[PDB]
Write a protein that binds this ligand. Structure first.
Ligand SMILES: CCCCCCCCCCCCCCCCCC(=O)OC[C@H](COP(=O)(O)OCCN)OC(=O)CCCCCCCCCCCCCCCCC
Ligand code: SF4
Ligand code: SF4
Ligand code: SF4
Lengths: 138, 152, 69, 385, 93, 176, 309
């Protein structure tokens, strides 16, 4: 609901909506859903025998496309900061812009999520919830 | 800094100088608050104005007894409040639901729904310990906004 | 009954300023003289004339009998 | 048609009673309100308690009456137990039973005059109301909710005082009711705000099962206050008001004359009280005194057992009702034969007095509807019957 | 020449304050009813015939007066006869 | 009996209409009446300055719980359980045990100050007059986890004061 | 230094009503047997300065169901014309000597109804869509009851400008020939500015802490303005050329008493139940207005007392 990476998109009401960076090469990474994250911990908290055997979190099916950025504006139809405003909680034109566009689908020999089951969530069903813009009905 | 931390002795003073409360009259604890509005223990003009629209509130007050037919309607009004809010519930039936406590259709606590900060006990708290609870609340505001972004 | 009297002496004093201020501007801008008003076009014609012959460029100064003797 | 639910709105009055309005443009012609905001599980809850232990849950049934409730309970129990209460005790139940009517009939006008929107008669009368809660604290136990009337008559005697206080109180009250006469009666706008509104006068005004005012002040002379006795209550002299037509303004003018009766009765009751005892003497129902439950042997066994269990009530159904200051008060107390009662079904006003809002409302405005409600004097938590 | 430099301060002051109000110190990162129509039409009728009634105080420092007397009273007549036929039907108004 | 209020036919003659015509037209009503009954402002405001001033009470006023004891400390409670069986909210819970001296005392002692509905019957049920509703409204902590009073609040709370308590019982025990 | 006359009229008039919500309650206080602000002042006088800080701290959440270009547009004009109407007003010297200004006050006040139609409409449904309409529908009925009886005293005073209005009332207190008009002046002006007897007045409930304060600050700006406008018209004061200070002493102090009247009538009366509220204008007010409109024409003619201009 209230992460930074998916809310980095659609908070870009601007004089230009550019992807990163006008290219559909590496997009995207593996957006695992947040219920699967909290479900992996509670199974492992008395698993047993899960010490040292580090685990990896599978995402959805399967890699992902450039369509995601077009998927934002299609369906959206185009906490202790301060008393007034924080002076610097920016979009950070620095190494922030590259920490997500470096996908690295890593080694599948980690067990790491389906064995710490059961976590299976698509993207197309949970996308209605988090996105919220001016139409709200159609 | 001595310069910056001097400022929140105005702002965290100003919010504890003008509170615009909502009251939810549901049961017999509503009637005693009206006598606090009656000018013996005159509730107005000790920092705090009378009733107000549901939009412009800071301190909501749940009084009386909650039923399961009111548990949705409480949360929706609780969402519409702005951010520096506080919940203070009077009445012994807002702290565990008094007795009626073992009944099939009474919200157990008025704490498993909203997060509440100050608990006044009693079938009717006699509009004598309740101004004492409000001066407890302004005493609770010793918080800071500077040295929060100035620390982290 | 007493406490309302400091309430009266705040907002009522807050209206004392602009009537005092404006009457200490146009009196000050014309040097202790009131401002020449003009409601009819014949009335303006005096100020349109007399500014050109006052001494240099002013409408709030006079010449008097001793000008042309 | 627009289907607005002007109710849950915390627009003063009593932020509750959420209903529907199928208004025909401007007129309403269809009103179907919803109740049940406080159901509380009352009538199921009493089925596990005893008689003395269940008693304050009658007290918290109104917001206002503290001695008119529990008057409808002990008198609903003493008939089952073949007891008349002692004579000093009956003069107090009429005194506080004719002092709670000087709490409803103050609240029934001011709170009606606040929905309407007048500010100053709300503060001009509750500041005089404070002179009366000092009585409640001085006699029983608390601010309002007092477990004071018992089945064995009065709990304890009122202390030294309270006779040059009530006479001090009641000799300076008719000036305060002469204030609101200047505030509302001779005024035109409030008269224009309520004339010919809620004209319900036919025999369906009684087929709907209404109790008093929104009765006799609309017509049919009948009341439970001198055709049915309670205690020493017929030995005092008074009259009952009747208004002219069947609207709200001729059920409003009951309540001005009604408060002009309770002053007479208090000034008649004080002259007639004899000295005597408090409780019923046979002590199978009343507890014995504190100076007795520390000396003899017979006192403790009829003390220690009388709180583990309650009384011994004979079986056989019963029913009664008295004059609540807004209506009848039905209690159909089913007895079984032990310390714990069986079913205890209550009838409160508002079942009749608000189901007949359907007949009363239509043909009229929307701003009429809020002005209707504060005339019947409907209090929620009391519609939990 | 300040009229026009007289209100320009007033309107730039209102649009300034909203930016400190709605903007930067926030940063969160019909059914038709006939009876509610005919009064607007009725108002505009009596809104016109007060503008013809409007030039009166300049119409007194004038020539022979009984022309200006008997005719100015006639507009009030037409403003009043218009009431009476409309007074036959106002509706729930 | 009867009374017919608001039942009076009008006058309807030449002169008395002028009292009803001057009423509507020039408003001799609504100002002589309602502009004078408001003012009426010169009376003294009867307001209590609560942190400084306080209001009246009664000697039989209820409030905070406390426990008493004899002269030099004895635990006046005898754990005869009667206050438990008449509590309407069952806020009492007592586990007793023979203490090694021989006389029975308490181990756990609870008052659910949340659930406590203040029927005060505990004050009128103890034979050895142990529990007393102490007249102090000092309250309002910040958690639900705190108001459940254990025993070592109550003996301490019964010993923050006693002369407050011991004078009210001694002025009221003759009535009850 | 024309600019410093501007800032020494706009700014010193904001504190004239920012310190009135205090006075609103204390006058309300000492009727109900209760005191003013007690803990903060000490005499109250430190209360509104802190409360003014709060409404710009508290977060103004915006409706997602509305536009933004229309929603802040109504507070733009709210301080615009409701402060512009102060400008050609004498004390004893106006900022602008307008040749005609009584029409100019009505020309600006007629756009006050053009603001309420914005905020209810562009926001939301029902309440904000139907409930905000009726309030225009009452306040369109109080220009014809306003402007006609306004015109009936210009027939006797003489002209349109306001500077001649002082000289023509130097002996009179002109309520004495127009005490029937004095009611229908003050009743109608009370009704337009949306106050306690004439109230039905969703066009506020959607505004959070930011822009509610404007349409609480602009509405109050109107009410002392209808006081100061009745002040120069009915209860005219004396004028001294050599002593201009003595004018303003007995000028605002007379308007300050009539300022209390809106606070004083509010503490007496109920509402009017909308169907009556327009019914008491057309059926009841308006036929007397035409009659007295005919009255002030024939009588200066049948006096040979025409006012010169
Ligand atoms: C022949 C010589 C030439 C002619 C000379 C004759 C002189 C006549 C002077 C008449 C001018 C004043 C009368 C103007 C009309 C007044 C309005 C009115 O009377 O309406 C009456 C109002 C409507 O209801 P109604 O018709 O009475 O029906 C109910 C009957 N029981 O019912 C009411 O009574 C209610 C009153 C109106 C409600 C609003 C009241 C709010 C309080 C306002 C206080 C005003 C204080 C004074 C004004 C301030 C001073 C500037
Ligand atoms: S028990 Fe307490 S909260 Fe419940 S109705 Fe009674 S006074 Fe109100
Ligand atoms: S008050 Fe009585 S019943 Fe309660 S613990 Fe003490 S002795 Fe036992
Ligand atoms: S104080 Fe009241 S609730 Fe608590 S034990 Fe005594 S009677 Fe029961």
């Amino acid at each position: 609901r209230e992460d930074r990476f998916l809310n980095y998109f659609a908070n870009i009401r601007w004089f230009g909506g550019v992807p990163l960076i006008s290219l559909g090469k590496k997009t995207v990474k593996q957006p695992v859903y947040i219920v699967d994250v909290t479900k992996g911990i509670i199974n492992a908290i008395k698993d047993p025998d899960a010490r040292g055997k580090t685990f990896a979190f599978v995402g959805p099916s399967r890699y992902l496309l450039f369509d995601l950025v077009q998927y934002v504006f299609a369906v959206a139809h185009r906490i202790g900061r301060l008393f007034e405003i924080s002076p610097f909680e920016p979009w950070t034109t620095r190494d922030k812009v590259e920490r997500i566009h470096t996908t690295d689908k890593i080694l599948p020999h980690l067990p790491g999520l389906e064995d710490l089951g059961v976590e299976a969530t698509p993207l197309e069903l949970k996308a209605i919830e988090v996105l919220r813009r001016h139409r709200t009905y159609r | 800094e001595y310069v910056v931390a001097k400022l929140d002795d105005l702002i965290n003073w100003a919010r504890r100088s003008s509170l615009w409360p909502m009251t939810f009259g549901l049961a017999c604890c509503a009637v005693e608050m009206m006598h606090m509005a009656a000018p013996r223990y005159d509730m107005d003009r000790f920092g705090v104005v009378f009733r107000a629209s549901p939009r412009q509130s800071d301190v909501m007050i749940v009084a009386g007894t909650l039923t399961n037919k009111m548990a949705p309607a409480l949360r929706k009004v609780y969402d519409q409040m702005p951010e520096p809010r506080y919940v203070v519930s009077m009445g012994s039936c807002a702290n565990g639901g008094g007795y009626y406590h073992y009944s099939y259709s009474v919200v157990r606590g008025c704490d498993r729904i909203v997060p509440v900060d100050i608990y006044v006990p009693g079938c009717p708290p006699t509009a004598e310990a309740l101004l004492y609870g409000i001066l407890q609340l302004q005493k609770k505001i010793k918080r800071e906004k500077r040295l929060r972004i100035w620390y982290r | 009954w007493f406490e309302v009297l400091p309430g009266i002496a705040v907002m009522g004093v807050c209206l004392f300023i602009p009537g005092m201020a404006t009457a200490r501007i146009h009196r000050f801008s014309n040097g202790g003289k009131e401002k020449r008003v003009a409601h009819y076009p014949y009335q303006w014609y005096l100020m349109e004339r007399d500014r050109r012959v006052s001494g240099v460029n002013r409408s709030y100064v006079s010449k008097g009998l001793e000008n042309i003797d | 048609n627009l289907t607005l639910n002007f109710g849950p709105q915390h627009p003063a009055a009593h932020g509750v009673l959420r209903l529907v309005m199928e208004l025909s443009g401007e007129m309403v012609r269809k009103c179907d309100p919803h109740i049940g905001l406080l159901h509380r599980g009352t009538e199921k809850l009493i089925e596990y308690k005893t008689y003395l232990q269940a008693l304050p849950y009658f007290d918290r049934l109104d917001y206002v009456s503290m001695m008119c409730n529990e008057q409808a309970y002990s008198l609903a129990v003493e008939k089952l137990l073949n007891i008349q209460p002692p004579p000093r005790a009956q003069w107090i139940r009429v005194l506080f039973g004719e002092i709670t009517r000087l709490l409803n009939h103050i609240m029934a006008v001011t709170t009606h005059a606040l929905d309407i929107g007048a500010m100053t008669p709300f503060f001009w009368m509750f500041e005089e109301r404070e002179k009366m809660f000092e009585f409640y604290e001085r006699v029983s136990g608390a601010r309002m909710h007092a477990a004071y009337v018992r089945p064995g008559g009065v709990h304890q005697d009122l202390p030294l005082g309270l006779m040059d206080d009530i006479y001090e109180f009641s000799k300076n009250f008719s000036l305060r009711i002469d204030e609101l006469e200047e505030m509302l009666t001779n005024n035109r706008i409030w008269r224009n705000r309520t004339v010919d509104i809620g004209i319900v006068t036919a025999e369906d005004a009684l087929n709907y099962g209404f109790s008093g005012v929104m009765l006799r002040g609309s017509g049919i002379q009948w009341d439970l206050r001198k055709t049915q006795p309670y205690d020493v209550y017929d030995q005092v002299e008074f009259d009952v008001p009747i208004g002219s037509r069947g609207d709200c303004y001729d059920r409003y003018l009951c309540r001005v004359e009604e408060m002009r009766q309770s002053i007479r009765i208090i000034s008649q009751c004080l002259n007639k009280m004899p000295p005597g005892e408090i409780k019923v003497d046979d002590a199978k129902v009343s507890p014995p005194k504190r100076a007795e439950m520390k000396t003899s042997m017979e006192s403790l066994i009829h003390h220690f057992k009388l709180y583990t269990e309650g009384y011994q009530v004979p079986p056989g159904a019963t029913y009664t009702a008295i004059e609540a200051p807004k209506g009848e008060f039905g209690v159909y107390l089913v007895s079984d034969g032990s310390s714990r009662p069986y079913r205890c079904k209550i009838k409160a006003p508002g079942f009749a007095h608000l189901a007949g809002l359907d007949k009363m409302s239509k043909g009229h405005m929307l701003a009429d509807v809020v002005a209707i409600i504060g005339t019947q004097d409907i209090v929620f938590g009391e519609v939990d019957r | 020449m300040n009229l026009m430099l007289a209100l320009l301060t007033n309107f730039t002051l209102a649009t300034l304050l909203v930016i400190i109000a709605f903007w930067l110190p926030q940063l969160n990162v019909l059914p038709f009813s006939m009876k509610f129509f005919l009064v607007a039409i009725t108002f505009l009728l009596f809104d016109l015939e007060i503008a013809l009634l409007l030039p009166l105080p300049w119409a007194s420092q004038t020539a022979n007066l009984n022309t200006m007397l008997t005719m100015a009273l006639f507009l009030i007549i037409l403003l009043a006869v218009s009431l009476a036929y409309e007074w036959t039907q106002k509706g729930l108004e | 009996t009867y009374k017919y209020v608001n039942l009076r036919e009008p006058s309807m003659d030449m002169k008395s209409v002028t009292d009803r015509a001057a009423q509507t037209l020039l408003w001799t009503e609504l100002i002589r009446g309602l502009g004078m009954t408001l003012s009426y402002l010169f009376r003294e405001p009867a307001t209590i300055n609560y942190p400084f001033e306080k209001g009246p009470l009664s000697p039989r006023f209820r409030g905070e719980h406390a426990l008493r004891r004899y002269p030099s400390g004895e635990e006046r409670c005898i754990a005869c359980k009667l206050c438990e069986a008449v509590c309407p909210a069952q806020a009492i819970t007592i586990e007793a045990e023979p203490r090694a001296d021989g006389s029975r005392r308490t181990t756990r002692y609870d008052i659910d100050m949340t659930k406590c509905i203040y029927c005060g019957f505990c004050q009128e049920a103890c034979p050895v007059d142990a529990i007393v509703e102490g007249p102090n409204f000092e309250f309002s902590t910040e958690t639900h986890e705190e108001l459940l009073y254990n025993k070592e609040k109550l003996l301490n709370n019964g010993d923050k004061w006693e002369a407050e308590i011991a004078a009210n019982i001694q002025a009221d025990y003759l009535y009850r | 230094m024309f600019m410093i006359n501007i800032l020494m009229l706009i700014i010193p008039i904001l504190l004239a009503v920012a310190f009135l919500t205090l006075v609103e309650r204390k006058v309300l206080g000492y009727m109900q047997l209760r005191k003013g602000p007690n803990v903060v002042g000490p005499y109250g006088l430190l209360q509104p300065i802190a409360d003014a800080i709060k409404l710009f701290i508290k977060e103004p959440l915006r409706p997602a169901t509305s536009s933004a270009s229309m929603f802040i547009l109504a507070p733009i004009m709210a301080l615009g014309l409701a402060l512009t109407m102060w400008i050609p007003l004498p004390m004893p010297y106006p900022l602008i000597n307008m040749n005609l200004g009584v029409l100019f006050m009505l020309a600006m006040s007629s756009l006050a109804v053009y603001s309420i139609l914005w905020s209810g409409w562009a926001s939301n449904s029902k309440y904000a869509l139907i409930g905000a309409l009726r309030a225009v529908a009452q306040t369109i009925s109080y220009e014809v009851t306003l402007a006609i009886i306004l015109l009936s005293v210009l027939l006797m005073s003489g002209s349109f400008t306001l500077s001649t209005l002082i000289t023509t009332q130097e002996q009179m207190w002109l309520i004495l020939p127009a005490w029937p008009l004095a009611m229908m002046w003050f009743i109608s002006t009370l009704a337009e500015t949306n106050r306690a007897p004439f109230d039905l007045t969703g066009f506020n409930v959607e505004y959070a802490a930011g822009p509610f304060a404007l349409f609480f600050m602009a509405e109050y700006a109107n009410i002392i303005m209808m006081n100061i406008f009745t002040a120069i018209l009915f209860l005219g004061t004396s004028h001294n050329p050599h002593m201009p200070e003595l004018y303003t002493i007995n000028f605002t102090i007379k308007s300050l008493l009539l300022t209390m009247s809106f606070l004083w009538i509010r503490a007496s009366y109920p509402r009017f139940r909308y169907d009556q509220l327009m019914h008491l204008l057309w059926k009841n007010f308006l036929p007397l207005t035409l009659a007295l409109c005919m009255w002030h024409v024939s009588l200066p003619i049948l006096t040979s007392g025409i006012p010169p201009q």
